[PDB]
Amino acid sequence: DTKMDPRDFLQLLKINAEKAEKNLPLDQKRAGMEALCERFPRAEGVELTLTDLGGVPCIRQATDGAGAAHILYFHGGGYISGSPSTHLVLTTQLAKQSSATLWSLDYRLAPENPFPAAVDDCVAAYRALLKTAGSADRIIIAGDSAGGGLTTASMLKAKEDGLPMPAGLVMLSPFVDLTLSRWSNSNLADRDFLAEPDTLGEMSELYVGGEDRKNPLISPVYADLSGLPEMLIHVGSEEALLSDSTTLAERAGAAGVSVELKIWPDMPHVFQMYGKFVNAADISIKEICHWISARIS
């Protein structure tokens, strides 16, 4: 079917950015994210079981004939928004193109619960998911933006605690440096009509809550990423957070982790959400799944 020329779509995200609301109450910005992200298409044949993990709410997802593999998923939303719901668009596709049961976790958001609330839930869930899954070998962790920072964060916290490392980590435009201070952050700020300057600011501020911005469990890009499992990273070119994806790859790289990074031309922050319009959205999903299942094999 028909698609948008990447650039034009950017022009679309740009126009939407301009008319964006000035100071929208956090509770409404949320409600409208749900309303909005509900007009998007959910993969067909993906039953949405409303279950839980470690007492943390989650929308399990799987096709009728799903394998034994498992994807514990953390959504994005600057740590202050988003929900398993909002991301069905992406996860339903992930769960289907990989024949795996995907567990979209509803970890707590800030300011109601700042760090380490979310990280904590991600661990608890994993811990739970190990038992259910049977082996850490058939599990994979994934998330977009902030959700990408938790897929690492939680695994570092898990290593600390003493749990076995998953088979792999998949991150989409990871948000891993809350100091908002690297090359892309300033150089591409204009180009990013989603992860905006003032946006990330309060985003970080609220999540950090007094705590230290360079706390490894908050901005993994400063951690001892040693011991973590292989990680795949996809990121768009039009991203202020581009340098997070490259810097986390560098460190984890030098930290001794296996890393695969792909930077997609003309794609915006977490483009995998806009399959509806841009082709790469699909190519990426397909590549992310070929990657996942190959690991759980």
Task: Yes or no: say if 282 and 252 are a contact pair by the CB < 8 Å rule.
Answer: no
Secondary element (H or E) of residue 161: helix 146-161
Known catalytic membership, residue 145? yes
Selected catalytic residue, list 87, 184, 239, 243: 239
Known catalytic membership, residue 181? no
d(CA 124, CA 126): 6
**3-state secondary structure at position 237:** strand
**3-state secondary structure at position 267:** strand
| CATH superfamily to which 1-297 belongs | Alpha/Beta hydrolase fold, catalytic domain (3.40.50.1820)
Report which residue type is found at 289. Answer: C
The method of structure determination was: X-ray
Taking the CA atoms of residue 155, residue 60, residue 260 and residue 243 in that order, the dihedral angle to the nearest 10 degrees is -70
Whole-Å CA distances, 1 to 95, 279, 282, 288: 22, 10, 12, 21
d(CA 293, CA 132): 18
Strand order in the sheet with 259-268: 47-53, 56-62, 101-105, 70-74, 139-144, 169-172, 231-238, 259-268
Handedness of CA 17, 23, 27, 32 (dihedral sign): negative
Report which residue type is found at 181. Answer: S
Q: Which residues contact 285 (CB under 8 A, 6 or more apart)?
A: 90, 93, 94, 97, 272, 275
Selected catalytic residue, list 70, 243, 269, 284: 269
**Which residues are registered as beta bridge partners of 59?**
50, 104
Task: Yes or no: say if 102 and 62 are a contact pair by the CB < 8 Å rule.
Answer: yes
Known catalytic membership, residue 239? yes
Per DSSP, 52 falls in state E
Q: Which residues contact 253 (CB under 8 A, 6 or more apart)?
A: 259
**Count of all residues that appear for the chain in the document:** 297
